[PDB]
Design a protein around this ligand. Structure first.
Ligand SMILES: NC(=O)c1cn([C@@H]2O[C@H](CO)[C@@H](O)[C@H]2O)c2ncnc(N)c12
Ligand SMILES: CC1=C(/C=C/C(C)=C/C=C/C(C)=C/C=O)C(C)(C)CCC1
Lengths: 324, 346
């Protein structure tokens, strides 16, 4: 602890201006500046402008070719929807609020907004996990009686929602609470205290283990295996120069994929863990907006990595953009 | 990238091979996108043998009303097993598609091989084409002995394995009519792989198969069919006119025997078309072309053509290579459709 405790707020900035009470309705200028709000608003604008076209394309491309409407694409559609939850739950709200210089939807609004943003990001998280699993199962062949057929695909999609709800729903029932994060113009998860009265401590442990560490292990496992397999395959089929280059490229891509998972959730995990292991921090309040920037950008980079670099989608997209 | 990952899974399956439900076969990249559903390579999880799984998607089946064609292909392949007709191993359905799981022909198809030999090679060498043509003839003969008119035969339905022996497949384009009712009006087969008789909605018999054979050989050598050059991609009506009227230019790339054989078949009239004379299946066999063919060796599948596919050389398309055809626009199956789908499965 090094912020300001309250029975319904935890401002990650120290109380010494006497206006650190209720950051819900208090104008934020005791831990932020007008220029920082312009930059915040700029960043949120960017994330919408990129994120919405990118996710629209993922849905769009399958509709223009019949054969793309198949089970193995379901998870990709799910990813795009998940990302759109982040756009309308998180990005738009934060853009609106930042220009007033404080969060204007009030405590109830904070719970709503925080729910939609968290829900979004968590469906996204679990999509990436499921995707890695599916790739590992299908290509490396380690498990028997699994396929990516219609029933399996649907289960996979459903699972990402269920796990996401399992995280986003608890702070609404008083197992934690949504309270302003960052410059206090966005609402995040309370994890700054192990405040028993709202039951924060158990929730924070649950989050760190189930929603970061578990994913992290799975991501490393799956992608390690995948790189092994692809290297091995290339060695067993050296007769195409293209395939050898591709194998190296795919390995590079896989590093990017792992890194992309890290960037998104590691900041939150890192900060939360540090305060818990050693009480107090020298983290600022603008510092807490840094994890949000990284997390939010995954609405842009996930479909870029997982859609754009596959041949079929490319052809279709090129055709439509060059008149179609 | 991901296409290479799909290629890697294929390489993995091949390696294992060299050394129901679709959940009992591990599924790899597609080898083409049929008229109905995917056609991918696959491997038995409990046997460790490779099979092709021709999936016929339920949605696409309803759209074209392709129920008759499916049932025909099943019954014929199920009954006819040789070294010139692919063996059928399983016929089941899933909840999304009907499956025919047939024995491998790992070496790719003749249609592929026109372009895979090298694009700067103007079709097959004459002996190599002659060998494959002879093997197609034995397969046609076996069908004719069961009194089956195949109609549409084409390069893509002549598959190569890694033994350098070919077999016909896709026998759903056939009709079984016993002798003395072979003649009957009808239009069947895919345009540009049809005989004059069929297009005009006239009576047909085994003659049409010999027309198709001619088209196939012509395409083997010249790297183009008779009814399209390499600048032609014209509509059905013009394509129909090509089939009906034209006796095309015959390259000097041909041997005199092969040239002559092509000339006879691509000249209109079944009577003047080799094979059909009184309806012989050994009318083909009298041509000087078959001086290089021994019938005993042909029947035993011992003919060796130049270029024989390897098992460490992959033949197959990438997984996301699709053609795409109508799937439902909010359209829900009739009871009748469901009844055909169950009936097919066995
Ligand atoms: N139906 C069959 O018997 C087969 C179809 N294909 C491929 O699937 C493509 C059709 O989509 C064909 O052009 C072949 O490349 C096959 N590939 C290997 N073995 C087979 N028995 C078949
Ligand atoms: C608190 C916390 C986590 C999740 C934080 C989340 C989900 C933040 C979402 C912020 C958004 C969506 C901003 C816009 C982890 C990574 C599970 C690890 C444990 C600490």
């Amino acid at each position: 602890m090094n912020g300001t405790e309250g029975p319904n707020f935890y401002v990650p900035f120290s109380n010494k201006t006497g206006v650190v009470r209720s950051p819900f309705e208090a104008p934020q200028y005791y831990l932020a500046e007008p220029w920082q709000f312009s930059m915040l608003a700029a960043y949120m604008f960017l994330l919408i402008m990129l994120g919405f076209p990118i996710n629209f394309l993922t849905l769009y491309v399958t509709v223009q070719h019949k054969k793309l409407r198949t089970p193995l694409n379901y998870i990709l559609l799910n990813l795009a929807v998940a990302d759109l939850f982040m756009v309308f739950g998180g990005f738009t709200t934060t853009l609106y609020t930042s220009l007033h210089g404080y969060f204007v939807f009030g405590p109830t609004g904070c719970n709503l907004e925080g729910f939609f943003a968290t829900l979004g990001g968590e469906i996204a998280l679990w999509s990436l996990v499921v995707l890695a699993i599916e790739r590992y199962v299908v290509v490396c062949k380690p498990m028997s009686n699994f396929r990516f057929g219609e029933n399996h695909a649907i289960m996979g999609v459903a699972f990402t929602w269920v796990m996401a709800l399992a995280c986003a729903a608890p702070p609404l029932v008083g197992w934690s609470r949504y309270i302003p994060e960052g410059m206090q113009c966005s609402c995040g998860i309370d994890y700054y205290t192990p405040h028993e009265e709202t039951n924060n401590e158990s929730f924070v442990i649950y989050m760190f283990v189930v929603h970061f560490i578990i994913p992290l292990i799975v991501i490393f496992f799956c992608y390690g295996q995948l790189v092994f397999t692809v290297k091995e395959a290339a060695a067993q089929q050296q007769e195409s120069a293209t395939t050898q280059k591709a194998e190296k490229e795919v390995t590079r891509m896989v590093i990017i994929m792992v890194i992309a998972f890290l960037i998104c959730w590691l900041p939150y995990a890192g900060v939360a863990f540090y305060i818990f292991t050693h009480q107090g921090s020298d983290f600022g309040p603008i510092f807490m907006t840094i994890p949000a920037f990284f997390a939010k950008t995954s609405a842009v980079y996930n479909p870029v990595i997982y859609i754009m670099m596959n041949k079929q989608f490319r052809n279709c997209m090129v055709t439509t953009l060059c008149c179609g | 990238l991901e296409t290479v990952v799909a290629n890697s899974a294929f390489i993995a399956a091949r390696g294992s091979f060299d050394a129901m439900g679709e959940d009992w076969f591990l599924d790899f990249r597609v080898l083409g996108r049929g008229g109905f559903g995917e056609v991918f390579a696959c491997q038995m999880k409990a046997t460790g043998k490779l099979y092709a799984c021709k999936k016929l998607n339920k949605k696409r089946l309803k759209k074209r009303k392709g129920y008759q064609g499916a049932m025909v292909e099943k019954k014929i392949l199920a009954k006819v097993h040789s070294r010139f007709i692919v063996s059928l191993a399983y016929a089941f359905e899933t909840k999304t598609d009907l499956c025919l799981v047939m024995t491998i022909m790992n070496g790719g198809d003749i249609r592929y091989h026109i372009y895979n030999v090298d694009e700067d090679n103007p079709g097959f060498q004459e002996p190599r084409a002659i060998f494959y043509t002879a093997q197609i003839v034995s397969g046609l003969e076996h069908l004719h002995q069961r009194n089956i008119i195949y109609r549409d035969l084409k390069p893509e339905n002549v598959l190569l394995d890694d033994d350098g022996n070919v077999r016909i497949s896709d026998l759903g384009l056939a009709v079984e009519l016993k002798a003395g009712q072979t003649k009957t009006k009808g239009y069947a087969g895919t345009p540009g792989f049809m005989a004059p008789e069929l297009l005009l909605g006239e009576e047909y018999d085994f003659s049409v198969d010999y027309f198709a054979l001619g088209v196939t050989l012509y395409e083997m050598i010249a790297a183009r069919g008779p009814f399209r050059a390499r600048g032609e991609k014209v509509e059905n009506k013009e394509l129909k006119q090509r089939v009906l009227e034209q006796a095309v230019t015959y390259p000097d790339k041909f041997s005199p025997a092969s040239k002559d054989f092509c000339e006879a078949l691509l000249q209109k009239d079944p009577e003047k078309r080799l094979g059909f004379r009184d309806g012989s299946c050994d009318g083909l066999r009298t041509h000087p072309l078959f001086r290089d063919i021994s019938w005993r060796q042909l029947e035993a599948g011992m003919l060796t053509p130049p270029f024989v596919p390897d098992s460490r050389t992959v033949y197959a398309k990438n997984i996301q290579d699709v053609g795409a055809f109508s799937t439902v626009k909010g359209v829900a199956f009739e009871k009748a459709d469901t009844e055909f789908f169950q009936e097919f499965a066995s």
